[PDB]
């Protein structure tokens, strides 16, 4: 049904609070962060190039927790 | 020897162009990005908190390249 009859853009359409990132996929040549929305149509693709400006603090933080780390060499 | 006798801060001391981020280390319970400098003392430890504000673009982009997604849950 989507909130409000008036057509609304994609990610960060109005300015709703970011719930939590739960997706990431590289399209033609740019990440497509799957932004989650509490009220809005949860989950939506957004070009990394566009997302970075929307909220770098959010994206940067997402990677921090999702850090696996390779392997420390010290033979 | 360091450029200029006058003491200079750490990362983003004056405002020299950022060559390229080498990586990141969780020092003191906080991720730190080693900013590489072309003219300045190449490589310097900087807290994620300070780095994000200095240049989120380079920061976000760094992970974008060194990114890897896990196996798709759905069988």
């Amino acid at each position: 049904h989507m909130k409000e009859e008036s057509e609304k853009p994609r990610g960060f359409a109005r300015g709703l609070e970011p719930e939590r990132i739960i997706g990431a996929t590289d399209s033609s040549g740019e990440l497509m962060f799957l932004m989650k929305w509490k009220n809005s149509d949860e989950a939506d693709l957004v070009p990394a190039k566009e997302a970075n400006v929307k909220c770098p603090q959010v994206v940067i933080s997402f990677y921090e927790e999702r850090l696996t780390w390779h392997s420390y060499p010290s033979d | 020897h360091m450029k200029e006798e006058s003491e200079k801060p750490r990362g983003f001391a004056r405002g020299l162009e950022p060559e390229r981020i080498i990586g990141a280390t969780d020092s003191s319970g906080e991720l730190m990005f080693l900013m590489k400098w072309k003219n300045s003392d190449e490589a310097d430890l900087v807290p994620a908190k300070e780095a994000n504000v200095k240049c989120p673009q380079v920061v976000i982009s760094f992970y974008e390249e060194r990114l890897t997604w896990h196996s798709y849950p759905s069988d």
Partner: peptide
């Protein structure tokens, strides 16, 4: 299949790989 082309892709768990900062330092003349 206009702008909203994306419908199905990956839904796993993103992870970043990093080798610290000065973890590796290959050298032969040493």
């Amino acid at each position: 299949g206009s702008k909203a082309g994306d419908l199905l892709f990956i839904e796993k768990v993103p992870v970043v790989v990093l080798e610290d900062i000065l973890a590796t330092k290959p050298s032969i003349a040493s």
